[PDB]
Design a protein around this nucleic acid. Structure first.
Ligand SMILES: [Mg+2]
Ligand SMILES: [Mg+2]
Ligand SMILES: [Mg+2]
Ligand SMILES: [Mg+2]
Ligand SMILES: [Mg+2]
Ligand SMILES: [Mg+2]
Ligand SMILES: [Mg+2]
Ligand SMILES: [Mg+2]
Ligand SMILES: [Mg+2]
Ligand SMILES: [Mg+2]
Ligand SMILES: [Mg+2]
Ligand SMILES: [Mg+2]
Ligand SMILES: [Mg+2]
Ligand SMILES: [Mg+2]
Ligand SMILES: [Mg+2]
Ligand SMILES: [Mg+2]
Ligand SMILES: [Mg+2]
Ligand SMILES: [Mg+2]
Lengths: 142, 144, 129, 258, 187
RNA sequence: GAAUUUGGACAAACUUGGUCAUUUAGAGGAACUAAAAGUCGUAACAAGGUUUCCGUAGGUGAACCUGCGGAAGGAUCAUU
RNA sequence: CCGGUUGGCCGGUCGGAUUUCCAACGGGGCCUUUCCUUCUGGCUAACCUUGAGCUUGGCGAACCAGGACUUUUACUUUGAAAAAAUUAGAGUGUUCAAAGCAGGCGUAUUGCUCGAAUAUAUUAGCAUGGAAUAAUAGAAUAGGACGUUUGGUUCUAUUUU
RNA sequence: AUGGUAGGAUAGUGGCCUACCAUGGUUUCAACGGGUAACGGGGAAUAAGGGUUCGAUUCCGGAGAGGGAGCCUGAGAAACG
């Protein structure tokens, strides 16, 4: 959020070409889409300047499959957070339950700002990395 | 509140307590440590063949006055030495020497059976012929 | 400390009915205590009770006839499905013709036989016979 | 492993074929065709186990090679050709015409139809798209591709297919008050009118359905096949008409006729 | 050989996996192309399902597109000047995707003369009508036209030479040209 | 287009170590159990003939003995 | 107020059931301070209407469609999608039975015909009704909810001139 | 090793591999290690209710062809008649 152009390659959206001949307002062509399933595309994606190839709104991924909910327990990666899904597991012999949990690494777009303690909902995508298969679609706590 | 936890989310404590206290048993500990596979002469099988080493005159415990007529046998699969009690009246006159005997337990699940101090096995067959068939003169032995 | 005010209420009622007394003071008088007592009262196991309003939680004075053998609580409130009701009634009722397992279902607190009529289940609270 | 399987053990075959568990280790594995191998009926099990016109697979092959049977008007001298839902089967010796429709027990019925009716079949459209050079097409439930369709035909409609040509005669849309056939699931074989459909964006649209005795049920949209408006169907329904009498009413009806 | 699977790596917890399976063929990997410049040499690779794949080794020319001008010409490649993954590819003159190269630029100047009638850097009536009608579009940019004076244009490789065999690209323009220019002129 | 040949990745194996998970021999010890008409005493059981037991320290042929603090499971429910 | 099941009713045929009916159990509609949210259209559902008692001109789910605002769970009900075999189980005299899924009935010559049920199958995922019981959130240096206001910044963008 | 950006390779996604960069990722709710006389499931035996023990083996999935590794052909093999 201090520069866009940090890497050695030119960061740009693929096949979105801004014609150097013309001169208008609305400075650059920015491609964005709605991810579907009633998730609202955030204004920071529509108006921003970040590139973020793995974004569910401006980038080349699609949300399909499970929609999950967790609480952010780690933000120390770059564009990646770890959420914690807590559930109760039933044991039939003793006729009662026990607390269990899983950690899910999810990708977070620069449209969203999360801290530790926020509740997020994530949507399944194709494999992003070795462990990441989920992508943040709405941050709605603090 | 009767000891143990009763809460609806307290299944983990109950499970691990049951495992820890399951180790206090005899059959469970024996089956899970696998002492039959490791520290048993038969190695967990029901029967075993062996080779007779000598004939013993083990005397019974008190109060009982007798000579119990067992044999020492070296197991064929292990090479382990084993004492086996030759069951009936006069049946030690079949079990003479260097023979292939078949052995079983006595039924006491690894314990020494009676007044007989320290034998845990009995003879079933000698030289491929069963001992009761020899005893009831249904069959008779080969030469060797 | 006090975890189950309903359990304390039912234990006090049991001690009173063992001793032969016709009354008992219950403290501290929750809502589930009122609904449990109303279930016991409709089947004729207690009689009239009165809710004393002090401003903290309430007390209750129940009047006891001689008809109650044992009212009990089941702690924890196990989740109970519809076949589970018949196994619970077979375990903790003295006969198949009288006694009630009380269970809090989503349509209010009721006994097991009215729950069979409404075809609804829930969590088990206690029993009465 | 290592490639496609070519055998099919008995006890793994679909249960609605009604193949007895003894008399052989194998079942006739349906070859690749217009229908999925679970929701299909090979011609060997139709000719031998349902019509009893043969005693062996060898006799079924002997019937097939003299080009007697033809399925949807094409000859098909294949033993395990998958005949599926709404296929017509013509036996010109005996001049017989069958349509594969389910009875309410969930099995394929021997539904004899007339010679006028054997001239068509219904198909549920599975996708409408634009092929190459911008030509639209539909794909029916048995995989027929039909070019230049009507623009009003969207998915989950039924189109009437001519079976001499591959052309479309007319079509039934999808809304409330439409007579449906359930092909798939627990309610397989039942016929009822659709009351309403549930949007469920993200997977598995449900549809609520009530038969003539006012018994409702619900099914996924994958298993529903619209067959007309309420009253007239576009095909002849089999005996029973998809009613699903309970077992109490069924032994009462059996003790009537016995 | 080269396997493409994830069972040989550690788990996310960090444990060492046991060898579940021998290396399967549907997870194979193949050696790189390392496409040099000059004297075109295309080998074939038979891949999964038939489906031939063209390893270009040592490609010479390419089809390069001028995006603001909407054309594309078959132009000779001079050499790679920048690569965001590795400097040894710039040194060894390997051609991959996203390689910044220099191209010949003479077909582009021939098209620009034949289309607009003005020369870059420093007869019939029909051509006069055509060249007058598309006026006020013959003023492209400063940076590209200075390259046209120098006869070498900066292009970016948009094709994958080890996969298709072809080395296609587009001429650098605008802010992307300024970015790679600051990268190139950086000491 | 054959032999041959350069680099590379994959990599079976080999030689020299070094760790650990497994067996054998083994001078000697060092106990425990069972069975044993052995030897010397008599520590405990009665106030067991010095009440017994605990923890700790030292000593002694063997039980055990002695110091310090504790217990009653004591031989005292008891002195307005 | 209203219908839903079990009754009950002249035992109407001498163990069949036309409901004016008593009773019990289980739902729904409305009012009582009771918001248990509604921005655009066709269609009007009830419907203003209404013909002398089938008429021409009122409230959108009554029927859908379109977008917009959504405290979060656990629990329980119903259902979908859960491979056969095996388990439980229905029909059928393998001569009985274990089995099997066969078989039965005629003028047995042209044949006719009933079947191959059904239930269970956890935990997780999915759809749905309930909302008791356990939790969770909210308006407190108001930054709160409203709002026909009275306005100002700022962003799209149609049909049109 | 966990992630980021580009490439390469693949039928394709992905530290799958490379270059550069950042310091992450798992764990008492039991990670990591060790053991298994451990292929998993449908299922079996014995049970009032709850359970306990087993499942190499008629079906479904996986793996292997003395041990390892490499590959040709082909739509499909890291194939062992
Ligand atoms: Mg609790
Ligand atoms: Mg012992
Ligand atoms: Mg004795
Ligand atoms: Mg095979
Ligand atoms: Mg076949
Ligand atoms: Mg002493
Ligand atoms: Mg003494
Ligand atoms: Mg003494
Ligand atoms: Mg003493
Ligand atoms: Mg990549
Ligand atoms: Mg990467
Ligand atoms: Mg093994
Ligand atoms: Mg084995
Ligand atoms: Mg197998
Ligand atoms: Mg193999
Ligand atoms: Mg071998
Ligand atoms: Mg091999
Ligand atoms: Mg062989």
């Amino acid at each position: 959020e201090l520069t866009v152009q940090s890497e050695r390659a030119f960061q740009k959206q693929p096949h979105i070409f801004n014609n150097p001949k013309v001169k208008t307002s609305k400075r650059t062509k920015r491609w964005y889409k709605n991810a579907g399933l009633g998730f609202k595309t955030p204004k920071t994606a529509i108006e921003g300047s970040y590139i973020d190839k793995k974004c569910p709104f401006t980038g080349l991924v699609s949300i399909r499959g499970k929609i999950l909910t967790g609480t952010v327990v780690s933000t120390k990666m770059h564009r990646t957070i770890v959420i914690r899904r807590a559930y109760l597991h039933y044991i039939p012999k003793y006729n009662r339950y026990e607390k269990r949990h899983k950690n899910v690494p999810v990708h977070v777009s620069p449209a969203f700002r999360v801290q530790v303690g926020d509740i997020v909902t994530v949507g399944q995508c194709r494999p992003i990395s070795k462990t990441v298969r989920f992508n943040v679609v709405k941050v709605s706590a603090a | 509140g009767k000891g143990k936890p009763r809460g609806l989310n307290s299944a983990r404590k109950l499970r691990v307590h049951r495992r820890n206290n399951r180790w206090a048993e005899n059959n469970y500990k024996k089956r899970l440590l696998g002492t039959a596979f490791k520290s048993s002469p038969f190695g967990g099988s029901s029967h075993a063949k062996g080779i007779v080493l000598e004939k013993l005159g083990i005397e019974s415990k008190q109060p009982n006055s007798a000579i119990r007529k067992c044999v020492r046998v070296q197991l064929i699969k292990n090479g382990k030495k084993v004492t086996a009690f030759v069951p009936n009246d006069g049946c030690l006159n079949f079990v003479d020497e260097n023979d292939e005997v078949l052995l079983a337990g006595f039924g006491r699940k690894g314990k020494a059976k009676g007044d007989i101090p320290g034998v845990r096995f009995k003879v079933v067959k000698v030289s491929g012929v069963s001992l009761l068939a020899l005893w009831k003169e249904k069959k008779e032995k080969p030469r060797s | 400390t006090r975890s189950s005010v309903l359990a304390d209420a039912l234990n006090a009622i049991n001690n009173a009915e063992k001793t032969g007394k016709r009354q008992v003071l219950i403290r501290p008088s929750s809502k589930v205590i009122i609904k449990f007592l109303q279930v016991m009262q409709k089947h004729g196991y207690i009689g009239e009770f009165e809710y004393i309003d002090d401003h903290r939680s309430g007390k209750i004075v129940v009047q006891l006839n001689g008809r109650l053998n044992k009212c009990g609580v089941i702690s924890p409130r196990f989740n109970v499905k519809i076949g589970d009701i018949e196994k619970w009634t077979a375990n903790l009722l003295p006969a198949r013709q009288f006694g009630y397992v009380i269970l809090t279902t989503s349509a209010g607190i009721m006994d097991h036989e009215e729950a069979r009529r409404k075809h609804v289940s829930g969590k088990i609270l206690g029993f009465v016979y | 492993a290592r490639g496609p399987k070519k055998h099919l053990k008995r006890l793994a075959a679909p249960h609605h074929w009604l193949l007895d568990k003894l008399s052989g280790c194998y079942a006739p594995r349906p070859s690749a065709g217009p229908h999925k191998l679970r929701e299909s009926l090979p011609l060997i099990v139709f000719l031998r186990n349902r019509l009893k016109y043969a005693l062996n697979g060898r006799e079924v092959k002997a019937i097939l090679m003299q080009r007697h049977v033809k399925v949807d008007g094409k000859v098909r001298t294949d033993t395990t050709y998958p005949a599926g839902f709404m296929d017509v089967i013509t036996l010109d010796a005996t001049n017989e015409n069958f349509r594969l429709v389910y009875d309410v027990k969930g099995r394929f019925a021997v539904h004899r139809i007339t010679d006028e009716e054997a001239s068509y079949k219904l198909g549920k459209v599975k996708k409408v798209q634009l092929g190459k050079k911008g030509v639209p097409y539909v794909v029916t439930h048995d995989g027929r591709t039909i070019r230049y369709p009507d623009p009003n035909i969207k998915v989950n409609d039924t189109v009437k297919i001519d079976l001499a040509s591959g052309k479309i005669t007319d079509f039934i849309k999808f809304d409330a008050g439409k007579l449906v056939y359930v092909t798939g699931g627990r309610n397989l074989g039942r016929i009822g009118t659709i009351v309403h459909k549930e949007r469920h964006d993200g997977g598995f649209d449900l549809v609520h359905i009530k038969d003539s005795l006012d018994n409702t049920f619900v099914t996924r949209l994958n298993n529903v096949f619209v067959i007309g408006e309420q009253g007239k169907p576009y095909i002849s329904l089999p005996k029973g008409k998809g009613i699903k009498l309970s077992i109490a009413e069924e032994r009462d009806r059996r003790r009537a006729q016995q | 050989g080269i396997s493409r699977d994830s069972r040989h790596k550690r788990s996310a917890t960090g444990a060492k996996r046991a060898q579940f399976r021998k290396k399967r063929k549907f997870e194979l990997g193949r050696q790189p192309a390392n496409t040099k410049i000059g004297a075109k040499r295309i080998h074939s690779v038979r891949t999964r399902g038939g489906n031939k794949k063209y390893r270009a080794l040592r490609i010479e020319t390419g089809n390069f597109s001028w995006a603001s001008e909407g054309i594309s010409k078959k132009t000779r490649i001079a050499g790679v000047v920048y690569h965001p993954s590795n400097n040894e590819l710039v040194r060894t003159n390997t051609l991959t995707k996203a390689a910044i190269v220099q191209i010949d630029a003479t077909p582009f100047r021939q098209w620009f003369e034949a289309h607009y009638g003005q020369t870059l850097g420093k007869k019939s009536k029909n051509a006069e009508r055509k060249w007058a009608a598309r006026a006020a579009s013959a003023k492209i940019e400063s940076s590209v036209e200075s390259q046209f004076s120098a006869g070498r244009l900066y292009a970016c490789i948009s094709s994958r030479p080890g996969q298709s065999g072809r080395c296609d690209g587009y001429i650098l323009e605008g802010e992307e040209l300024a970015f790679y220019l600051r990268r190139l002129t950086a000491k």
